[PDB]
Design a protein around this ligand. Structure first.
Ligand SMILES: NS(=O)(=O)c1ccc(NC(=O)c2ccccc2S)cc1
Ligand SMILES: [Cl-]
Ligand SMILES: [Zn+2]
Length: 257
C-alpha cells in the first residue's frame, strides 16, 4: 500500500505515514496575489543553466524526472531570497487529466494545466541527501504551464516519454537544455515550504514564476499517456499527480515585483 494519488492512497492519506503532512510549512499553497507583498530586500534572481548536463529520464511511478549530473558546479540558481548557491539536480512536472487542473500551486485559486519543478540543493550542505535535513536545504523553481502554443524546448522530453511509459523505466537523456523551458520574465513569488510529495520534508524555499509557459494540447496529452503502474500491470494513466493547496498558516508570500 504505497502512497499515490488515488482515493485510498492519495493526499488525504499521506499524513498517516508522514505526519509532517499537517505541518507548519507545507506546500503547495494558493498564491493570493493581492496579499503577497513586494519585498525590496530580494536580490536579483539568477538562473544559470548554460552548463547544465542532463543524464537520464525516469518514470518513478509518481511523475517523470529529468536528472542532471550535479557532481560539479554547473546549472545553479542563486540570488532572489536565496543565500548562497543552489545546484540543479532534476526537474519534473505535475499535471491533470484535463486542461482545467494539474498545477500544485494556484494563483488566486486558479489552477494551471501543469507545473514544472526545477529542484536544486544548497551547495553548502555537500549533497542532496544532507540538504534535505536542513530548513534551507532546497530551492524549487516552479513554472506554470498553460495550454496554447507549443513549447519547442519541451518536445525532446515529450518524444522520449514513450520509452519510459511505466514505473521503474529509465532512458538515457543527455544534452537536454532546461533554458528552453523558461518564460521571458523571472518575476516571482517566494515563500518557505516543503516537498509536495512524501516525505513532504520542510526544507524548501519556493520560487514560483508569475509568467507561465505555453505548451500545446498535443504535448500535455502525451504526458497523460504515461502510467503510474509498472510494466505488465493494469494500466492506470499518470494524470492528476498533484497535491492540492495546503494551509498557509504562519507564512507570508513575498513578490519580487
Ligand atoms: N514536488 S517537489 O516538491 O518539487 C519534490 C522534489 C523532490 C522530491 N524528492 C523526493 O521525494 C526524494 C527524496 C529522497 C531521495 C530521492 C527523492 S526523488 C519530492 C518532491
Ligand atoms: Cl484511480
Ligand atoms: Zn514537484
Amino acid at each position: 500500500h504505497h502512497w499515490g494519488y488515488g482515493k485510498h492512497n492519495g493526499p488525504e492519506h499521506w499524513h498517516k505515514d508522514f505526519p509532517i503532512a499537517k505541518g507548519e510549512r507545507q506546500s503547495p499553497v494558493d498564491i493570493d496575489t493581492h496579499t503577497a507583498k513586494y519585498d525590496p530586500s530580494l536580490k536579483p534572481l539568477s538562473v544559470s543553466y548554460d552548463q547544465a548536463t542532463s543524464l537520464r529520464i525516469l518514470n518513478n511511478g509518481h511523475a517523470f524526472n529529468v536528472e542532471f549530473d550535479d557532481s560539479q558546479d554547473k546549472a545553479v540558481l542563486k540570488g532572489g531570497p536565496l543565500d548562497g548557491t543552489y545546484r540543479l539536480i532534476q526537474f519534473h512536472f505535475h499535471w491533470g487529466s484535463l486542461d482545467g487542473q494539474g498545477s500544485e500551486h494556484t494563483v488566486d485559486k486558479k489552477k494551471y494545466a501543469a507545473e514544472l519543478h526545477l529542484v536544486h540543493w544548497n551547495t553548502k550542505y555537500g549533497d542532496f541527501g544532507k540538504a534535505v535535513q536542513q530548513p534551507d536545504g532546497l530551492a524549487v523553481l516552479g513554472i506554470f504551464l498553460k495550454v496554447g502554443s507549443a513549447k519547442p524546448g519541451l518536445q525532446k522530453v515529450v518524444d522520449v516519454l514513450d520509452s519510459i511509459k511505466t514505473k521503474g523505466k529509465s532512458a538515457d537523456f543527455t544534452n537536454f537544455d532546461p533554458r528552453g523551458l523558461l518564460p521571458e520574465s523571472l518575476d516571482y513569488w517566494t515563500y518557505p515550504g516543503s516537498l509536495t510529495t512524501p516525505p513532504l520534508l520542510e526544507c524548501v524555499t519556493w520560487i514560483v514564476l508569475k509568467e507561465p509557459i505555453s505548451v500545446s494540447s498535443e504535448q500535455v496529452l502525451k504526458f497523460r499517456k504515461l502510467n503510474f503502474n509498472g510494466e505488465g500491470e493494469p494500466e492506470e494513466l499518470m494524470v492528476d499527480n498533484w497535491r492540492p493547496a495546503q494551509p498557509l498558516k504562519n507564512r507570508q508570500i513575498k513578490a519580487s515585483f
